Structure formats: C-alpha cells, structure tokens
Amino acid sequence: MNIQILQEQANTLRFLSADMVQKANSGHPGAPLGLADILSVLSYHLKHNPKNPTWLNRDRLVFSGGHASALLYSFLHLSGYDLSLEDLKNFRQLHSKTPGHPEISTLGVEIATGPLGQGVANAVGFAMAAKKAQNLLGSDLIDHKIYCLCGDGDLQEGISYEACSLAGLHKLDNFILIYDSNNISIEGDVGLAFNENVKMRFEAQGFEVLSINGHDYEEINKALEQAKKSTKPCLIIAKTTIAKGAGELEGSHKSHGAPLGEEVIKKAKEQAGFDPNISFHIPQASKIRFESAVELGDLEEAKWKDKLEKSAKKELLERLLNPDFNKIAYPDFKGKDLATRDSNGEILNVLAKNLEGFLGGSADLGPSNKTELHSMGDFVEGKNIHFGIREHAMAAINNAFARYGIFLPFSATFFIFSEYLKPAARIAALMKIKHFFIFTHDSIGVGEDGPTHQPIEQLSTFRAMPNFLTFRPADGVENVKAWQIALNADIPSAFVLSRQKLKALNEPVFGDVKNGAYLLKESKEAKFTLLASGSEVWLCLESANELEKQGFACNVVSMPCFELFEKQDKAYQERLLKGEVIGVEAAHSNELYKFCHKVYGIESFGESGKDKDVFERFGFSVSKLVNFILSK
Amino acid sequence: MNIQILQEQANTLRFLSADMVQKANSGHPGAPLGLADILSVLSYHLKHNPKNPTWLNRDRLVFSGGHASALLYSFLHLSGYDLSLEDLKNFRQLHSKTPGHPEISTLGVEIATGPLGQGVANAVGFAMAAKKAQNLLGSDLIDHKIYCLCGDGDLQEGISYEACSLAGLHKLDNFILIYDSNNISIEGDVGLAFNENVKMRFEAQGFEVLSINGHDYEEINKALEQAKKSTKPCLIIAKTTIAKGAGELEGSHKSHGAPLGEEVIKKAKEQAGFDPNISFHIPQASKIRFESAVELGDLEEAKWKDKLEKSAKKELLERLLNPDFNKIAYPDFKGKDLATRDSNGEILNVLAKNLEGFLGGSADLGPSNKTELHSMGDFVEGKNIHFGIREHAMAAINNAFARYGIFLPFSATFFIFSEYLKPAARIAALMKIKHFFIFTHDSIGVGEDGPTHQPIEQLSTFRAMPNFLTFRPADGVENVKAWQIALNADIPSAFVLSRQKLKALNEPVFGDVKNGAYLLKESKEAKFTLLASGSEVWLCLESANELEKQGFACNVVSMPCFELFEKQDKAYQERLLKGEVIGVEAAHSNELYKFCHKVYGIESFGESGKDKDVFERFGFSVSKLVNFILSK
Numbered sequence A, B: 001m002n003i004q005i006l007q008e009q010a011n012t013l014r015f016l017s018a019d020m021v022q023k024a025n026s027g028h029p030g031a032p033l034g035l036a037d038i039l040s041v042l043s044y045h046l047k048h049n050p051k052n053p054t055w056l057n058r059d060r061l062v063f064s065g066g067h068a069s070a071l072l073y074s075f076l077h078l079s080g081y082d083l084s085l086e087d088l089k090n091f092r093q094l095h096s097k098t099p100g101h102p103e104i105s106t107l108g109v110e111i112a113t114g115p116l117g118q119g120v121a122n123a124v125g126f127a128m129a130a131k132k133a134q135n136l137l138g139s140d141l142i143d144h145k146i147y148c149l150c151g152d153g154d155l156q157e158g159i160s161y162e163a164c165s166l167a168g169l170h171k172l173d174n175f176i177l178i179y180d181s182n183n184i185s186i187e188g189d190v191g192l193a194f195n196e197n198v199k200m201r202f203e204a205q206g207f208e209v210l211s212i213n214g215h216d217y218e219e220i221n222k223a224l225e226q227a228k229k230s231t232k233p234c235l236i237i238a239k240t241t242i243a244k245g246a247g248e249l250e251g252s253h254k255s256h257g258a259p260l261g262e263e264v265i266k267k268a269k270e271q272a273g274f275d276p277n278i279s280f281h282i283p284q285a286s287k288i289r290f291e292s293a294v295e296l297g298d299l300e301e302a303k304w305k306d307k308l309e310k311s312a313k314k315e316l317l318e319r320l321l322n323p324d325f326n327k328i329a330y331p332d333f334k335g336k337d338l339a340t341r342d343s344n345g346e347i348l349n350v351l352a353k354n355l356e357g358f359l360g361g362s363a364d365l366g367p368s369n370k371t372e373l374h375s376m377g378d379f380v381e382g383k384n385i386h387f388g389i390r391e392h393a394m395a396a397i398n399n400a401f402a403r404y405g406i407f408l409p410f411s412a413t414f415f416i417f418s419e420y421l422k423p424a425a426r427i428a429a430l431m432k433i434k435h436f437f438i439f440t441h442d443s444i445g446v447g448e449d450g451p452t453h454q455p456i457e458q459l460s461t462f463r464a465m466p467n468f469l470t471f472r473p474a475d476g477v478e479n480v481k482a483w484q485i486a487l488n489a490d491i492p493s494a495f496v497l498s499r500q501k502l503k504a505l506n507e508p509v510f511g512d513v514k515n516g517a518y519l520l521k522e523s524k525e526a527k528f529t530l531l532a533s534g535s536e537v538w539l540c541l542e543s544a545n546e547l548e549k550q551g552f553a554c555n556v557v558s559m560p561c562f563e564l565f566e567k568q569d570k571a572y573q574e575r576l577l578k579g580e581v582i583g584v585e586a587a588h589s590n591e592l593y594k595f596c597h598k599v600y601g602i603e604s605f606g607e608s609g610k611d612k613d614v615f616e617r618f619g620f621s622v623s624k625l626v627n628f629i630l631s632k
C-alpha cells in the first residue's frame, strides 16, 4: 500500500471504465473516473470473498449511483469475481453480464440500482438487517460494514433523507456513506438546484461527518480508518472532479452521460503512462494487487466458518437459511365474517411465530393496517419495525432485508399510499425477491376519509407491473391460501385488503385460489358469469341468486389474483368464463376486459361519506348490478 | 387582542371541531384541539377576503395535515367564507361541502391535502409562484405570505425535505412553516421513529428557526411577528399537546383518529366555561371577532385594486388571467421524422413565447427531456426552473403554481420516474388543474440504460388514473394536436414521448387526434385492424402493407389517447374497429382489451441493449407481428 501502486490501480479502473463506455458508444464515464481513487483505496478495506458472493458476513458494497456501473464491473473483474474481460467488452449489449445499470443476476452485485436514492436507502437497510442478524446470531458471527457510494442526485431525492433519518435513530455504526461531491449533474453546476449545508444536515440526523479530497490517497485512507471506528453512522464528503484524468472533459457536465471520445482517452492514457493504442489493458502490478482479494477473502471466510462451527447459533442459522413453509398451521377462517385487514393481521402473527426470520412493519399505520406482531417486541431486540411516515424508504429498506440472506420482510401501508413506495416495489419485482407488501384500505369502502384515501387505479398498476402477484382476497380463507402461494412463489406479492368487514364465502366448486380465479357457483348452460375479487364477490353471489330467481343460469367466479389467472390454460379459463362475462370490481380496472365482455367498475375518483352511502352512490348494489347485467 | 378573547376564540374552534367529529362518528379531533390556539392567533395576522377567495394577493394558508380538516372548516365558517353551520353538521357525509380531507370545491380551500408531505411542498410552491408573480407584476402588487401548518407526519416524508431544500436555495422569505410538534403519531410516541434535531435540519437548508409553546398566546404572536420579518424561509417549531383541552385524552394517541366521546366533550366544555348540553355553539364575542375578517378583507382587497389601477402591469395581468390559446401558431411537423421528445421541446418553446404565464422545468433532465426554454432565462427572472433530482416535490410545487392564479406549469422527467411523483400527479387529477406532465424515454426503445429505465406498466397507471389524459403521440403533428387538446381541456394531461427518432405519418383518413383514436388506413371489408400508439404506429403501417400484399384487407388505427377514445360514440368506434382488432404497444397494456381482440405487448421487464436489438428481442418487427396476426 503506497502511492505508485494506488495510482496505477486507480488508473486501471479509469481506463477499463472509459474503454467499456467507448466500445458500447453508450454510458457514463464521468463518475467512474471521479470515483476511481476512492474505490482503489476502498479495495484495501473491503472484506469480501470474490469466489463466494453469498458469504453472510461480507462487507456489503452498494453503488447508489448505478450509472457508475462500468466502475463496479471493472472492480468485480479485477478482484476475481465471475465476470470476465470479454464480459467487460460487451458492456451494455443485449444479454451481456454487464448491463447499463447493475442487476443482481451479475454475481457480486448486492442490489439493483439505477433509480437515484434507492441505493442509499438500501444501504441503510443492509445496516439494519446486519444489526438484526447480530441480535440473532451474536457479534462473533456478524460484524461487517456497509459501504455506499452516492452522488449529488441520490442526496437530493427524498428517500435519502428518509432513510438517513432512520440510520441516525438506530445508531447504525456499521454504515459508511461516501458522497461523491463533484458539483456536477446533468443540468450542470449543482448550485443551480442545491446548496444545503450537507454536514449540518447529516449531523442533524445523528451522523459523524468527515470531509476529504477524494483524489488524495492518504486522506481517503485516513477517513476510512476513522469511519470504521465511528460510534455513529458516518458520511464521508469526498470532493472530486468529474472525469478526473480526462483532460478537457475534467469538471464538464458533458462527461456525465456520453463517451469521452477516442482522442480524449488517448491523451488521458498518455498522461497516466498507459499505452494509448491498446484498450482493456490491465497492468501487472495492478492485476496481482486487485486479485489478491481472492486469497484474502478465502481466508476471511474460512476464519468465519470456524467461528460458526463453535457457535451456539448454527442450528438457528440453518433454520433461517432453509425455512419450512409447508409445516405452518394457518388460522382457519372458514365461515367467519371479517375485514381482510384483520384476517391478514392474524396470519402475520402466525408467520412471525413460525419463522424466526419473518419481520417487518408499517409506515406509522400498525394499528390501522393490523400488522403489529403481538408480544414480539420492537426492533432491534424484537420483530416490529416502526418505519415512521416513510413509505418509500420502508420499501427500499425492506428490499435490502430481503437480499441480506436470512430475512422474510413485510412492508405495510394503506393501498392508496403504495404510490409513495412504487419505485422500490418495482426494484423488488425486477430482482424477483421475496418481499411482501401489505396494502389495507383497498377501495371506496374506506368511506369518510374521502377520495384522497380511496384507491381507484392502484390495482391496475400492480397488476401491470411484471413479476409481482397482486392478491385481493375475498375472505380469510382466500387470504391464507394467498400467503401459502406467496411464500412458495419466486416473485414478490402484494396483499390488497379491506377496512370493512367482508362476508365469508362458501367452498370452491371447481379450481382454487392457486389458479388465480375459480368457481364459487357453477350452472349448466350458464347465460352469465359474474367475475369479481375481494369485497365485490358477495355482491356477485347475491346478484347471481337474483338472476337465477329471474330465470337466468349464472356462474360466479372469484378472482383473488389476476396474474395467476393469466397463466392458466385455455381449458381451465373456458370452463370458468361462460356466456356473457361481467367483471365487477371497486376499481378502475380496464385490464378485466382480458377476461370479461363487460366491466362494472369505478371510472371517477371517490367521495367522502359513510361506506354504505359511497358504495350505493357508485352503483355497488344488487338492484343496480342486476339492471346493468340485464341491460335495462 | 387579549387573553380572554383569544381563549374563547380557540375554545370555539375546539368545540366546533370536536362536535363535528362526534356527529359524524368519524374523523380527527386531536390535531384540531392542538392547533386551536395557534390558528386563533394566526387569524389576526392572515390577510384574506372571505368574500373573494380568488383575491390574487391574499395570504395563502395550507393545512398540510389535511386530517385537521374540521379545524379548517370551523375557521372558514367563523371567518365569513361561504360555508355554513349546517355544512359543519354534515362533516364527512356524502355530498357535503365538508369532506374528511379538504378539497378545492369547498371555497376557501387553497389546495387539496390528505396525503402527508404534499402540503408542505405545495406551500413552497405557492411561495415560489408568489416570487415569480412579484417578478412579473412588481412588489407593489404581490407581497403576501404563505402559511403552512404541518405535523410530524409531514416532516418525516421525503417530499418535505425536497421542497424545503428548494425553499432555502431560493431564499423564500415569504414562506412561514408552522410545525405542530406534539410528539404523537398513530403508532404513539414519535420517538419510536424520529429523533432528528429539527432546528439543525432546517438551518442546514437555509431556514430561520423559532421555537415556541403553541398554547401560549403571546409567544405565538411574537413568533409570527418575527417570522413575518424574516429574511429567510421561517419554521416555527410549536410544541403542543395533542387534544389540548380534552382531559383524559390530552397527549393520547387515541385522540388522533377517533371521536373524543360524548362525556369527554361534556367535561371539556365545563372546564372551558361552555355549556356541555349544547353543540355547535358559537359565543357572541368570538363570532363578532372572527367575522371581522369580512370587513377587513374587503378593505384590504379594495386598497389592492386601487394599486392595480395605478399599475403599469394591468394589461399583463389581464393576459395572464385570460390566455388566448387559439391564436398560437404551432410548428408544422408534417413529413418530418423526429423523436417526439424533440418535437415536444419545440412546442414547449412556442408555448413559452406565446404565454407569459407558461413556465416549468425538469428534474435535472432538461438536456435529455428537451425541455429547456431557450433564451428565456432561469427562475426567478426567467422561466426555466431547475428542480434538481426531486421529481415528487417538483410535481407538488407545480400543483401549487397551477392553483396560484396566473401560471401554466409543466413538470418533466423520464416516464419511468413518473412513479416518483405519481402521488402529486394524482392530486392534480383530483383538483382538475391545468398542470402538464412531460414524460420522455417512454419504452424499451430507451435501449442501453436497461430495465430500470424502461417503462412497462406506467401507461396502464396513467390511463387508469381518472381526470388525466395520457397522450402518446406517434409524430410531431400528433404532438401538436395533443397540446391543442390539453390546453383546452378541463383536466391535466401527460405527454409520453420517445427517446428515439420516429417516422412521420400520412394524414388522417377519418377522425383525428381529438377523437383519441383515428384511422390512418381504411379498407373496405377489413379482416384485421391494427391499433397502436406512439412508436408502434409505423410497425403497424408496415405490417398492414405486408398483410395487404398477402391478400388481407386491413385498417390501421392510431390511438394517441386512450381516455379520449373511451368517450367516443358507438358509431365512431365501430367504423374504426373492424374485423379482428390487434393492439400493439411497447407496454404491458391489458387495458387495450377494451378495444382489441388480441394484444401484442410486453409482459416482462426490459433488457439492456441497443434499441434495435431490444425491440427485435421483444418481438417488435414486421415479420413477427404479421406471424402473430396470422396465428402462425
């Protein structure tokens, strides 16, 4: 560890990054060049095993500025991860292992980033998760750091403030945040849009704040040493020059987001002592020094595995890693009228009791979402997490809990406020992680709180989002079966739950919840089929009885999950969907036309009133639905 | 102005609020009771005309904690606004003027609130708008204050930090923020989730911070006096007790969100000297004192109208209030191949030149969204607003610009990051305000930036949202006609625009953009109709040519706006939608089943690659679409 080696290392990172962007004719060279000195030093402090990216006590590295991907990829390649030089040469190309922003399918990537702010919140979540894992497994087994690299953009996003608020409160002295302060964004000087006293901001949230030149190797190293000893979450404010090393592009906003150009790279390499007529060159000293992570990480993991073998907590870790969902005895809600917020809250309690790694909480709405895990304590000693009024950061935090390696997290709020966390929900879908979203107060049934609190379009959004199951159970029994699917599935799920009491259903006649839709009533030569979800299923059962009394044979279909029904074969769908099919939902859900000839929905916003008054106003009554179905 | 009158006034506000909640058996009495002393004093400082809620230079009052509605309504009633005592007795009832959270259809309500955080951001926007209005009209005509009441919940939301960041940067010394610091939220003690040094936080963002007892009338009054003289945006941290005055419920979380109960109200009234056996009682001194706002506000407005008549800026104000959209000469893009981000950016420039009140900006993406208004300067002297990486606050800010009274605002970002601002977009829809959303980079056509940057489900979301037009123009000409509709419509619109170059269309054969969908190609006895929007329309024109060469008559339908097409009559829809109708869109857009027998979409997330490689991978090619249409 000396200046000549660190300089060559940093420059190696620079020109791999620069050459990658240039070959793709696409990407972001500025931030890589600006961060290259920092990551060169950080490589000496990071504890990780390139050959086992799943090692539980590794330091977690997050690039919150995901546009800096070329740098990450360079570093994973150089350090010994399963990413090749040829992979680097296919940066940004279809089906490569080096996509434009980082994805977890590339080994070594902790969490997908790209949407700004998420990664900072993810890093706080990894730090919380680590403090919980320490609670469960002991500080002999869990003691690692969480390093996050962020930029101007990340810190302007609300979610950064939310998550850092929580990091201060919980005294996350395992969290180190490195701010790339280069005074440049896409619109140019960051002073056009931002002039906070960042040090004072973070100290207000309980951080220790260090301030460095991010191109001075000794200063970087001294800050990391001091940060690792902090009794607070720690922010390093690293002053850097965007595209450091790229001559005429140093400090230029034009370097943020477009290739540096062949002649600029040629000059840069000349000034650093690199041959300008070759690309993707790794000098020898740098190569050996970066790849020494392989031997060192192997040894650190072995030393840890020895501590595990002596630990009283081996059996526990194996249950966390291998949860048994099939043994769980769920509540039996058959014939019980209940609001599905209530059935779901009982289910949450059963899961928390059966699964040592199942935990979560609400965004200040525990008592209304019914998500309190009774007698299970408050984080960190217990399982209930009090996220505050921070839906977005809650979801990003729990995305990281779900990636940590031993946790099954849930996030809760009113379904209307799913919109505040939707970007993080999307990253859960993109990753295909097991993170459960609990959304109560699902419709105009909310009543008096009025239109700003009554979901209309949210079901469409979550249904349209790929890799994401949206369950809307009609009763407790459907709510159970939904959980059983959710825990076994390979993608995240949301639970869309009522404020108001719903009526228990009769048993399936054909199919079940696992088919997405199923028959509750089946009639030979059916003229109509009424298809509904959640709170609208009883309206449909009643309306079908009235239709039958009038001489019209009817099928009634419960559809607790649209996405699962889409996956059913033709023969199944044909048996359910007979005659003229009418879909009925307290939502604006045009997607139902995929399965329905007519849709009886809500096309406007809601109203403030008693639930029974609002449902009647919006047409959710037997007499009105039967008149629609009979077209008169 | 003395203690006995202020106490009676505050208690009048308390018991109207409490009695309203009790009669509804629904609502939030805690915050009203806690804020009642503050608003009693604030009533002496507020400049407003109850009989003309549109007076341009009124002080703007925002209740960011919209759950405190009962208090607002009590105050509007008492002050002389067109809200009656009978209206108060129908709190939270279907079709009343006193819905559970405030709505702009109730005169005197500045902006709809309810979703926490929005109002604080709205208040910053009203303060920016006021600084712009001052730039245009002079400080002789615009000099008012913006008062915002907020709670714990508002300040935990990210959007509060975003908006206050901007308030500091822009030195909004017309903005006064009153924080109801009662240490209680729904989950109880706020310390469970939040322990920031709030003073230090705000000072880091450029605020002056005062700290008071919010039940001491002289302290409240002295803070307001000092706040009105601040050279900074100012925060008053007002320590209050939730449900102050309600005995056993003082300081209780149970008072947040449920009626206080008849016996608690009886005691409260006894202790305050009010008769406990009557409800909705306004004592005489309080009545006369509150309603004096009528005479005083009339006089303040008259004095202002005199200043207007002497002003050089009368003609300008009349053009701002009465924009003439029909005279605008738009660019003629007929036959020109362009990315619609580019056509739209030319249109933005034309509008900014023709409309003195048209302004806006991007969330750090001006150069990529193509929204820079060239040669028009930077806010406040000019029209370009640099919002930073703050999509959510941008939208909430611009919602307030749209309510200020003289502005036509636009908000811009990548369509994928519409998800960060969607809750504010919703409030624009709920209010039916003229606020324009510019969303570029609309699909997998984005290419290399990959799946976190490629919209899939966002079209469904915006289509499903009521009162919101979603235009996805196929070329420059469609982009123009979309703007022409948008400016004349009574609801907000989004523009969904491409990164990549699109091909100019031939002229409509039947119908036009104003019908939402229209024919580009019409064939007698058509066997198929290919229906598309935006970038997919040329794929459809080409595929229809290939189908015709194979012997199949085809109609091609461009659908730049789904919502407008939904409103067309039967006869129009029937002429367009002939034979088997196939919808084609680079989105997961199941809503198309409303108009299409088959849908050829994207059902997964995207991929990082060259645009032509990704489109081919996802099946957007003539050969693949023709093979689907011919089912083989």
Ligand SMILES: Cc1ncc(C[n+]2csc(CCOP(=O)(O)OP(=O)(O)O)c2C)c(N)n1
Binding pocket: A030, A031, A065, A067, A114, A115, A116, A117, A150, A151, A152, A153, A154, A157, A180, A182, A184, A185, A186, A242, A256, B363, B364, B365, B389, B417, B420
């Ligand atoms: C939520 C969000 N909004 C917008 C963007 C678009 N975007 C990509 S990088 C960037 C700004 C980069 O600023 P900074 O973090 O200062 O990066 P640097 O210029 O220093 O590379 C933006 C706005 C994004 N990725 N995420």
Ligand SMILES: Cc1ncc(C[n+]2csc(CCOP(=O)(O)OP(=O)(O)O)c2C)c(N)n1
Binding pocket: A363, A364, A365, A389, A417, A420, B030, B031, B065, B067, B114, B115, B116, B117, B150, B151, B152, B153, B154, B157, B180, B182, B184, B185, B186, B242, B256
């Ligand atoms: C964005 C958002 N999330 C959640 C809620 C639900 N909600 C209503 S009031 C409230 C908390 C109230 O806390 P505070 O502002 O401290 O109000 P107080 O208890 O002092 O009345 C919440 C979480 C909401 N209205 N908006």
Ligand SMILES: O=P(O)(O)OC[C@H]1O[C@@H](O)[C@H](O)[C@@H]1O
Binding pocket: A367, A368, A369, A449, A499, B067, B186, B256, B257, B258
């Ligand atoms: O009866 P629930 O819906 O559980 O309570 C509704 C809550 O939602 C918000 O309006 C209030 O904050 C209130 O506490």
Ligand SMILES: O=P(O)(O)OC[C@H]1O[C@@H](O)[C@H](O)[C@@H]1O
Binding pocket: A067, A186, A256, A257, A258, B367, B368, B369, B449, B499
């Ligand atoms: O060519 P465009 O799409 O305009 O630039 C793309 C931008 O989007 C982000 O990935 C980068 O920040 C880059 O500048």
Ligand SMILES: [Mg+2]
Binding pocket: A151, A152, A153, A180, A181, A182, A183, A184, A185
């Ligand atoms: Mg920067």
Ligand SMILES: [Mg+2]
Binding pocket: B151, B152, B153, B180, B181, B182, B183, B184, B185
């Ligand atoms: Mg509070």
